[PDB]
Design an enzyme around this catalytic site. Structure first.
Site, mmCIF file in Angstrom:
data_model
loop_
_atom_site.group_PDB
_atom_site.id
_atom_site.type_symbol
_atom_site.label_atom_id
_atom_site.label_comp_id
_atom_site.label_asym_id
_atom_site.label_seq_id
_atom_site.Cartn_x
_atom_site.Cartn_y
_atom_site.Cartn_z
ATOM 1 N N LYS A 135 -13.193 2.886 0.580
ATOM 2 C CA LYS A 135 -12.893 2.859 1.997
ATOM 3 C C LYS A 135 -14.018 3.533 2.770
ATOM 4 C CE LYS A 135 -9.012 4.950 2.528
ATOM 5 N NZ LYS A 135 -7.795 5.285 3.325
ATOM 6 N N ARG A 190 -6.095 18.822 7.425
ATOM 7 C CA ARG A 190 -4.851 18.771 8.200
ATOM 8 C C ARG A 190 -4.418 20.168 8.689
ATOM 9 N NH1 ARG A 190 -3.496 13.316 6.946
ATOM 10 N NH2 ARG A 190 -1.816 13.336 8.495
ATOM 11 N N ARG A 219 0.823 -1.191 0.000
ATOM 12 C CA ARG A 219 0.000 0.000 0.000
ATOM 13 C C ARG A 219 0.860 1.244 0.000
ATOM 14 N NH1 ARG A 219 -3.852 3.663 3.573
ATOM 15 N NH2 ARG A 219 -2.198 3.496 5.170
ATOM 16 N N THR A 279 -6.093 -0.863 9.803
ATOM 17 C CA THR A 279 -5.759 0.101 10.832
ATOM 18 C C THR A 279 -5.667 -0.331 12.281
ATOM 19 O OG1 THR A 279 -6.486 1.957 9.494
ATOM 20 C CG2 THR A 279 -6.485 2.260 11.883
HETATM 21 O O1 LIG Z 1 -7.088 5.108 5.984
HETATM 22 C C1 LIG Z 1 -7.198 4.320 6.915
HETATM 23 O O2 LIG Z 1 -6.593 3.218 7.032
HETATM 24 C C2 LIG Z 1 -8.186 4.793 7.992
HETATM 25 O O3 LIG Z 1 -8.711 5.892 7.757
HETATM 26 O O4 LIG Z 1 -8.387 4.061 8.994
HETATM 27 K K LIG Z 2 -4.691 8.169 2.865
HETATM 28 MG MG LIG Z 3 -7.407 7.585 6.538
#
Ligand SMILES: O=C([O-])C(=O)[O-]
Ligand SMILES: [K+]
Ligand SMILES: [Mg+2]
Ligand SMILES: O=P(O)(O)OC[C@H]1O[C@](O)(COP(=O)(O)O)[C@@H](O)[C@@H]1O
Ligand SMILES: O=P(O)(O)OC[C@H]1O[C@](O)(COP(=O)(O)O)[C@@H](O)[C@@H]1O
Ligand SMILES: O=P(O)(O)OC[C@H]1O[C@](O)(COP(=O)(O)O)[C@@H](O)[C@@H]1O
Ligand SMILES: O=C([O-])C(=O)[O-]
Ligand SMILES: O=C([O-])C(=O)[O-]
Ligand SMILES: [K+]
Ligand SMILES: [K+]
Ligand SMILES: [Mg+2]
Ligand SMILES: [Mg+2]
EC number: 2.7.1.40
Lengths: 519, 519, 519
Positions: free
Chosen positions: A258, A108, A61, A316
């Protein structure tokens, strides 16, 4: 006595299944759950990157919310270099995929006290003024904090919460200014440069596919990446925008949406439909929605993806402890095992392998746990429910796939060998979750790489030239698989295996299932 | 709307299944349950015997507790004549088996008042003396009744019950004489010549395999009969004695043990083990044990046979009413359907087709009911339990068979075509009870005939000469099946079918399962 | 729409259940899973100790592998002080148990470079000599390391591994000396004073119940502790030794055996039998057996305890992150939820609340997660399997208990009120895991404290004086419960509740189940 929790997968009730889990029951050597490693400083060296592959990494990744195209292209260049160092033996060669994880619409902060790595420090009760005034973008300190999201004051209300640096520092909107916000620190801690900012329960209008994203996405195409992990996917249209951008030149790049926020969860069905896969991005999700509710979303999403037969990634913090320690915590070990038991196709590592001091131990720990867990799966019930919930179909390949899996359970076969061009035939075998590894033999390398997104599929890339006698070309490939298997330790000579083939060259003609003994 | 109870077989609970049975849901045209017809006066004519085959007969039962070898050989000769009249079209040809049902150790009375068909008449309370004195064997009347079982007084006690003519007339042992018995009629009715006599709860020492039996059995071999229905099988040794008698010359004749008494039921497991199949001979069983308990024994035996994968026949009185009427009673219709639902491989007719005035209507009524019931089977649950209760095995054919059945359920295939020499491969498919018909293609005619003993198997006899190119010889047979199917209405052109084959000539090599479309 | 995952617990398949988990489906307010907090420096202050009770603590663990009797007695004294500060309202009063966790047979190092908190530092490859020579017990450094276990050289072999400080530092036995060992650091890190030492796969002969243990155990009795957590329980005899020690004066103190090693796991059934409960002590287990295999042992132990109806505690590192952070990692949140879903009676905290900087946030985080998880349990299946796997019994209370649970599921009752002296009646309702909270009303305070060891039971201590009219004494208590319920938010006025009572005073006479509306 007892191998890969046999005594347990052969019990009438789940409860009895649990009572039978044996720590003294060794698992098979094959490992079905794909392992995606986020590549960074601690794992960018071709030298160590070869150890990543040896240790277990399947997909690399590239976190594009950082780094320059010049940087990543070098990361990519290194991955491929380390990867190919093994290509001198098609049998031992292990394909590796490259995934581009977009920055998406994130917020950010600026720079602290000018200095590159300077770190101020807020305190509970203390006040903090959030400024959009670019003059301060490199002058952040205990009183003035700068943000990218400029349209912020228009979406946040008085009484709202703002989290910074993985929801560790929380703030509350006391007064909404014109170009600023007067908050109050709810919990302090130190504050570094350019950190993450979450606005829970706030409709952030940022672009699904930003300017920079389109750049990175087109860079991905030029870099020939296998898949794209789209961040903050809120609706189906968002997924579509990413398709369009990748366009015709990259129509074959898998889009793994995601789910990082509350909208993504609500409109999940809509998103899953338009995507090729899903990633349960817990990091952001754990900040966007109350932490205690994350396992609900994870389990819900993983379940619905298993029903849909589309890949699902659990990512994560699975092994955070290991960023600084050689051993993971009991909770981290338990976390990984349950993601596999939940039925996730892939587990992931980020900080663990991007900057941690033990990237190889983290990857190795996931190979180990997933293998133990895969054996503790309760196939008896899973297979049954999957078949029941599976729609009615007249697709020969679909019937052939189920037949293969059932057959594989019947004889405890060492594997299910499948010949595939696009990967589809092997996907279908995977959606029915057999215990045996699915050795997918292919000549198309992109499909071999993309195959890691599926539970159970072990990609194997055939380099042999096509024979004129199709019958012998097929038999050649089935033997290729037969050798990879013998070498990787999946099965011996006498053992039995299931083989899937078709009746004519080209895709979509799989329909032949044979119980064959190993040569 | 709804075909072969699809809506119902797709329900979560049995109760919901039942609630969904639709009388307006037409069944498929194929009929899986074999129909055994006892041939006699009403059905011995080659002319009518052809109509028996058309109507549905699959096996012809020869009741050897009557008739002379000269008589039966002629019956046999007629069956084969009627059968072969169709052989001029291998596609439309329907194999027919010949079964010899032994007389075994039975007890019968002598002749009434000398006359051939004279009939006395007992009355409740009236007394009757049972004599063994051969002088009266042709002088039976309201006071003296003669019996074959001469060792009778030594096994029957004072207070015992003696039933005559299908337990319709009962008697009670008042006084045990030396060569006679002084009984008392419990319920009268008329009494004809040579009738049946049961001695419930009495250890009759008669020979498992009598003198005459050995004669008849050897006659069976010389007549080349497909199967033998052994009467009053009490223990395993009994089955063994019949094996020995048939010996080497008839080792391939299937021995279907008949459970007609209490010992047979107790030692069932022992018997089923040593036999090829079982027949639940309700007639005698209904006299030997209380009538209310017969359905228990039937369901028990049928269930254990399904578990063992051995053929089970439900026989006697299924359609008695029809001996004299064109319509069966509601109870008879209900009886047949439940035998099929119980999971019996074959249903049977005796008096209905041996002497009744509507043999053809009786046979036709069973084709009709079985088809309706076969569709009401709850496959979802049946398939599941069969697979669970099925032992663990590493036999490739076994795995291949389950795979085929699973695959067939997945695509609602029109059939499962299976190439087999011995029948074994098709047997295995059948033990898993698929909904689709199992078209078993074979060149061995004995196996084609014996195949009727299995639920689902539709025998088909290939007459084509063997091609030198094995591959094409196989393809030829698969197409033979494909045509029989198309012609019998099992499936059309576009339809999909499951095909089972092996990797080399000879038995025990089935291992190839293909989902193929119909030519 | 949707409360406490109703849509999900009402689905036919587990997979469908998962697909239905709704993060937008609020859980009930009641929390069934007990929370045991290890008390230490960060949570010893009566002032903060009141906040521990408010936040969720149910049991206070005293880790006796540290501290002096004088110290613990003060901790105990503080717990009770904070606890009773609420006793001025029997309705809002929340009982709190005190658990003594023995040191058991553990191995620890000496002091580093003399200094109290000095810390040397080993390095991979470097050698370290292990000395038993007491001269060095306060002179530990990078070359000489001292240990308590003196019989060490006699049980460890050449090639063995020795772990120190929660298996973070590993060593390998290169050479076995006479009174020492010459090892080689496999992985370094810093080394502090008196740290833990594990000798995986080594038969350590240390005493199940050591000298000090007997002292502590007797101290526990004098201190009137509710339960004892026995460390390193290897066999049943070990449990027995602890029973004996506690003897007659403390026969009512529950012995929760802790499975921390490999033998404990093997001889689990034997231990579970002789104990009152089990604790899956992951910390030591994670060092004693490979980490990847811990979830197997956890799920196995939890399952067998649910089968046996005895309390099971899942402990150690559930929320480590929180020792230094206000937020737990995604993995830790996932860990807790799965422990509840696994079916554990109690979750625990150690370092999280003994020395961490956020004890209250840790306890609060567990109240939150357990509540969410308890709602995600798949009752439909759990109830079914529990009843099936439940032995056949003719005990009226047992039958009454099941009936109450079934009834509770039928009307979605707000609770199951149970009157109990010993607790047994409420235990039995708990072993069938109803969704509704089990409000156990009692006058015996020890049983009200010990009740926390059971999933679902909400102890409530009745202070009212006994009425002479038993019927009204009972009705008074049931109303006490009725009020506790109304005040805690478990149920309103119109709501329905299940009530369990008996027919005469004394224990073992429960047999009356009533569906009553709330006053
Ligand atoms: O991008 C990731 O892995 C998240 O936001 O948990
Ligand atoms: K990212
Ligand atoms: Mg993220
Ligand atoms: O790409 P898919 O859809 O998975 O199909 C796999 C295909 O590969 C084969 O096994 C062999 O085909 P090729 O020779 O073209 O590669 C086919 O029979 C089958 O259709
Ligand atoms: O007779 P069985 O045991 O059922 O086996 C069926 C056999 O018939 C075949 O399909 C064809 O074989 P043959 O050519 O010898 O008849 C084989 O592949 C298979 O072994
Ligand atoms: O203590 P146990 O064994 O749980 O039994 C609970 C008992 O408490 C009651 O509900 C009320 O009895 P008491 O008044 O003596 O407490 C009894 O009917 C029942 O036998
Ligand atoms: O022989 C028979 O058919 C019987 O006894 O039922
Ligand atoms: O004692 C404990 O809790 C352990 O060892 O983990
Ligand atoms: K007979
Ligand atoms: K301890
Ligand atoms: Mg008979
Ligand atoms: Mg410990």
């Amino acid at each position: 006595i007892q191998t890969q929790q046999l005594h347990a997968a052969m019990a009438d009730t789940f409860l009895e299944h649990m009572c039978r889990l044996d720590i003294d029951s060794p698992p098979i050597t094959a490992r079905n759950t794909g392992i995606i490693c986020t590549i960074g400083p601690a794992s960018r060296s071709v030298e160590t990157l070869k150890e990543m592959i040896k240790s277990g990494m399947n997909v690399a990744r590239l976190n594009f919310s950082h780094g320059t195209h010049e940087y990543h292209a070098e990361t990519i260049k290194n991955v491929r270099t380390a990867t190919e160092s093994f290509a001198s033996d098609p049998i031992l060669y292990r394909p590796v995929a490259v995934a581009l994880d977009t920055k998406g619409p994130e917020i950010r902060t600026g720079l602290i006290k000018g200095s590159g790595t300077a770190e101020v420090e807020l305190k509970k009760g203390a006040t903090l003024k959030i400024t959009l005034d670019n003059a301060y973008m490199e002058k952040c300190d205990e009183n003035i904090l700068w943000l990218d999201y400029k349209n912020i004051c228009k979406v946040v209300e008085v009484g709202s919460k703002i989290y910074v640096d993985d929801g560790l520092i929380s703030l509350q909107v006391k007064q909404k200014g014109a170009d600023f916000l007067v908050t109050e620190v709810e919990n302090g801690g130190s504050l570094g440069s350019k950190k993450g900012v979450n606005l829970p329960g706030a409709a952030v209008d940022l672009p699904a596919v930003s300017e920079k994203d389109i750049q990175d996405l087109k860079f991905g195409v030029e870099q020939d990446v296998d898949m794209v992990f789209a961040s903050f996917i809120r609706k189906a249209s968002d997924v579509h925008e990413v398709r369009k951008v990748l366009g015709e030149k990259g129509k074959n790049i898998k889009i793994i949406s995601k789910i990082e926020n509350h909208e993504g969860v609500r409109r999940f069905d809509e998103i899953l439909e338009a995507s090729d896969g899903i990633m349960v991005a817990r990091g952001d999700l754990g900040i966007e929605i109350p932490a205690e509710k994350v396992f609900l979303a994870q389990k819900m999403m993983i379940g619905r993806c298993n029903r849909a037969g589309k890949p699902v990634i659990c990512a994560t913090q699975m092994l955070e402890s290991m960023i600084k320690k050689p051993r993971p915590t009991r909770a981290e070990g338990s976390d990984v095992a349950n993601a596999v038991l939940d039925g996730a196709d892939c587990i992931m590592l980020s900080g663990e392998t991007a900057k941690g001091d033990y990237p190889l131990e983290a990857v190795r720990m996931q190979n180990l746990i997933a293998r133990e867990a895969e054996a503790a799966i309760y196939h008896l019930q899973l297979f049954e429910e999957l078949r029941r919930l599976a729609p009615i179909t007249s697709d020969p390949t679909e019937a052939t796939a189920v037949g293969a899996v059932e057959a594989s359970f019947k004889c405890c076969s060492g594997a299910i060998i499948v010949l595939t061009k696009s990967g589809r035939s092997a996907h279908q075998v995977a959606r029915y979750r057999p215990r045996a590894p699915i050795i997918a033999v292919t000549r198309n390398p992109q499909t071999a790489r993309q195959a890691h997104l599926y539970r159970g599929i072990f990609p194997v890339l055939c380099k042999d030239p096509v024979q004129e006698a199709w019958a012998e070309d097929v038999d050649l490939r089935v033997n290729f698989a037969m050798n990879v298997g013998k070498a990787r330790g999946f099965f011996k000579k006498g053992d039995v295996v299931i083989v899937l083939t078709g009746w004519r060259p080209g895709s979509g003609f799989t329909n032949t299932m044979r119980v064959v003994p190993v040569p």
